[PDB]
Every structure is written in C-alpha cells, then in structure tokens.
C-alpha cells in the first residue's frame, strides 16, 4: 500500500524472528540445563569413587 506498511511488515518479521530467536536459544539452553542436571543426578562424588 504505502511506504510505511513495508516497515510494519519489517517490524513483524523482526519480532517473529526475535521470538523464534528466543526459542532457538532457550530450547538449547534447556538442553544444556538438563544435560548438566542429569549429569549431576548420575555423577557420584569423586571422593566416593
């Protein structure tokens, strides 16, 4: 339509890219998280070993 709805679509694509950015960060943050927490809930004390 105009010169500014392209900027509106730009903000639209930018905020959905930011939201999928938050997911593709925090999903893998949780992957790191539960790998560490599972490795704590398997790894015995070194002094026991």
């Amino acid at each position: 339509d105009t010169l500014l709805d392209k900027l509106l679509n730009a903000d639209a694509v930018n905020t959905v890219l930011r939201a999928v950015k938050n997911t593709a960060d925090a999903m893998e943050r949780g992957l790191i998280d539960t790998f560490l927490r599972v490795l704590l809930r398997h790894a015995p004390p070194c002094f026991v070993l």
Binding site: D1, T2, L4, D5
Partner: protein, 33 residues
Amino acid sequence: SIRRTGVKTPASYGKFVLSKENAVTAIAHHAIM
C-alpha cells in the same frame, strides 16, 4: 433554503491501511480467508 444536493464525500478511510475493501468481512470470515 435547505435543499437536497449531491455532495462529494470520500471513499475509503486509510491510504495507510490495507485497502482490501473487505476489511470487516474478511476478518469476520477469518476462520476461512
């Protein structure tokens, strides 16, 4: 003094908005585009 007269009035409301010309019926159809 008062008379019936053809008077110019505009058409749409936004050049800045989508001029789809549905604009009410489309979003009321929004289950199907």
